Design a protein around this ligand. Structure first.
Ligand SMILES: *C(=O)N1C[C@H](NOS(=O)(=O)O)CC[C@H]1C(N)=O
Length: 270
């Protein structure tokens, strides 16, 4: 607690202007200092579970050396809405590694469902998260049902804090073996969907990997990232939003603004 919120930031004004709730947890991995706002509340994961999904696939690949190269063929019935990569390879198939990259970097929904099946479904991904010490994360449903974002419904949710803690373990800690850790980082660095979220708050000369989520209802959207400022230790952070009404709109700008406040709260000159 001594190093939590050393510098107050106007998160309450930001969420009031947004018309909803914002949850933020940011960790300076050098000093241990944190910024924390609504950090232990639950927010829907939406597409953001797909980063942890890819990490779980990489963990499995440490015991199954042929897993990532395995070619997966799928039928048209697998192509649920928002499958921009897998729809281009319907007639050819794609490897497990390619599906993982597509789930992370293009948020591909068919790819995510196919990989969930490899892991034994939502309970299998939840079990992986438990195995790294995350007692908050839960996945309960598949794409697209997991995006319903119903107020008060704990299904398919985590907390900003647990998201950040698990992201740190998987990208910087020892939850994955070193080759798999670097592959996970590389997939996150190559994300294409987050340019208007945490990345918009991070200087262009710093490295950053992220995964976004956009449930499409209840103003519910999010992003988590690992950021490597030059000359100081990496920062890990998570920004989640939700709002009371089904037709409330999400805001990318609010996520970027919350990330800026988090970095300011850590004293990171950006
Ligand atoms: C994830 O939340 N989804 C996948 C896709 N875009 O993902 S992103 O916004 O997180 O990059 C479409 C929206 C959404 C969904 N409804 O599955």
């Amino acid at each position: 607690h001594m190093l939590t919120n050393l510098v107050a930031e106007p998160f309450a004004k930001l969420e009031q202007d947004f018309g909803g709730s914002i949850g933020v947890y940011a960790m300076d991995t050098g000093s241990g200092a944190t910024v924390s706002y609504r950090a232990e509340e639950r927010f829907p994961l939406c597409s953001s579970f797909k980063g942890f999904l890819a990490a779980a696939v990489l963990a499995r690949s440490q015991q199954q050396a042929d897993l990532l190269d395995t070619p997966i063929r799928y039928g048209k019935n697998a192509l649920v809405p928002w499958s921009p990569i897998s729809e281009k390879y319907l007639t050819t198939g794609m490897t497990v590694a390619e599906l993982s990259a597509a789930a992370v970097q293009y948020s591909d929904n068919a790819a995510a469902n196919l990989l969930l099946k490899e892991l034994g479904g939502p309970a299998g991904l939840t079990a992986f998260m438990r195995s790294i010490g995350d007692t908050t994360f839960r996945l309960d449903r598949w794409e697209l049902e997991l995006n319903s974002a119903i107020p008060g419904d704990a299904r398919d949710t985590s907390s900003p804090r647990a998201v950040t803690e698990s992201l740190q373990k998987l990208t910087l800690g020892s939850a994955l073996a070193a080759p798999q850790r670097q592959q996970f980082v590389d997939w996150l660095k190559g994300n294409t969907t987050g340019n208007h979220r945490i990345r918009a708050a991070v200087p262009a000369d710093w490295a950053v990997g992220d995964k976004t989520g956009t449930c499409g209802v209840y103003g519910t959207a999010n992003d988590y990232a690992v950021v490597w400022p030059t000359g100081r230790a990496p920062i890990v952070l998570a920004v989640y939003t939700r709002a009371p009404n089904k037709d409330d709109k999400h805001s990318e700008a609010v996520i970027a603004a919350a990330a800026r406040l988090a970095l300011e709260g850590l004293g990171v000159n950006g």
